[PDB]
């Protein structure tokens, strides 16, 4: 059972209780974007990250109480049609706003969660970089070759320093079974890790929300305000927001591994967490938004191909 979060008198997490950290409700975000939450019927802004001036030009306590009808006149109608009450919490509405801001919205219960991050004027994903990655995965003749090609494909799409295929054993210990890495880096092929390095509550969350990242492992998290959703007087679930603050226990693990940026995608086979496409970079790095979306689709393709290649040994 989860500890209360730190803003409800929970204790600070230590290695004795890592599996009890409520990582889905940190009440804070990463500083490379801004987050608002809004009521799903009125569009009233209920919660705002404290940095929302840096990306939206207006102050946190100034935005509170305004509506999305006023703030996003063009998207407010569309976002309502796209994310009705009761839709899946993994369903996303995406738009570009005009500099250019990527807007991502999802619905949790009666709450709309809006993430804003800067982006370049043009897509980073090549016209049909998606097609050649798909060809590469489909054409692999066996699971080993699939694993090799999936890591190299993802590395060529993303430019991450290290791209691993991280597979869970039946005892929940992990292993790097394939890797693509920058010239001069030492292989992590074949290295195994205890189950506690990706603890049970993290595995569970990764079964429902298929992509997460840490863009800067040294960057302080930005609080949301107020920290509790005023609808419920309870924590705002953030497991569907990529701007969610990362567990400090994992950020510290990454710092000690010389990692500035991390991103993974779940591989889900027969509804179970089979493994992760786990990416790392020596320097902080925000994977552009369009490239994330590509990478999420590829994880879904990879998952189907792994299930096929395993139906064959069986
Ligand atoms: C007492 C708690 C501990 C702990 C918790 C923890 N770890 C994760 C998430 C991840 N851990 C990962 C591990 C690795 N990344 C690598 O690059 C390597 C080795 C080469 C390992 C072993 C990974 C891949 C994840 C997923 C997230 C990501 O891709 O960056 C969480 C959840 C983090 C979150 O979503 O907020 C938690 C709570 N890790 C420990 O080592 C102990 C100290």
Curated annotation (Swiss-Prot):
Tell me the impact of changing residue 249 to C.
Binds PCB (in vitro), but difference spectrum is altered
Instruction: Recite the UniProt keywords alphabetically.
Output: ATP-binding, Chromophore, Kinase, Nucleotide-binding, Phosphoprotein, Photoreceptor protein, Receptor, Sensory transduction, Transferase
- PTM summary: Contains one covalently linked tetrapyrrole chromophore. Lacks the cysteine conserved in plant phytochromes (at the position of Met-249) that binds chromophore. An engineered sequence used for X-ray crystallography forms a thioether link to biliverdin through Cys-18. The natural sequence can bind phycocyanobilin and phytochromobilin in vitro, but the identity of the natural chromophore is unknown.
GO molecular function terms noted in the UniProt entry: ATP binding; identical protein binding; phosphorelay response regulator activity; phosphorelay sensor kinase activity; photoreceptor activity; protein kinase activator activity
Q: Where is the PAS domain?
A: 20-88
Name the residues that bind a tetrapyrrole: 18
Effect listed in the UniProt record for changing residue 250 to A? 100-fold reduction of chromophore-binding activity
Q: Its GO biological process terms?
A: detection of visible light; osmosensory signaling via phosphorelay pathway; regulation of DNA-templated transcription
Q: Where is the GAF domain?
A: 142-306
User: What is its biological role?
Assistant: Photoreceptor which exists in two forms that are reversibly interconvertible by light: the R form that absorbs maximally in the red region of the spectrum and the FR form that absorbs maximally in the far-red region. Also has a slight blue shift for the far-red maximum. Could also absorb green light. May participate in regulating pigment synthesis like the carotenoid deinoxanthin which could protect the bacterium from intense visible light.
UniProt family annotation: In the N-terminal section; belongs to the phytochrome family.
Q: What is this protein called?
A: Bacteriophytochrome
What is the source species?
A: Deinococcus radiodurans (strain ATCC 13939 / DSM 20539 / JCM 16871 / CCUG 27074 / LMG 4051 / NBRC 15346 / NCIMB 9279 / VKM B-1422 / R1)
Its lineage reads: Bacteria, Thermotogati, Deinococcota, Deinococci, Deinococcales
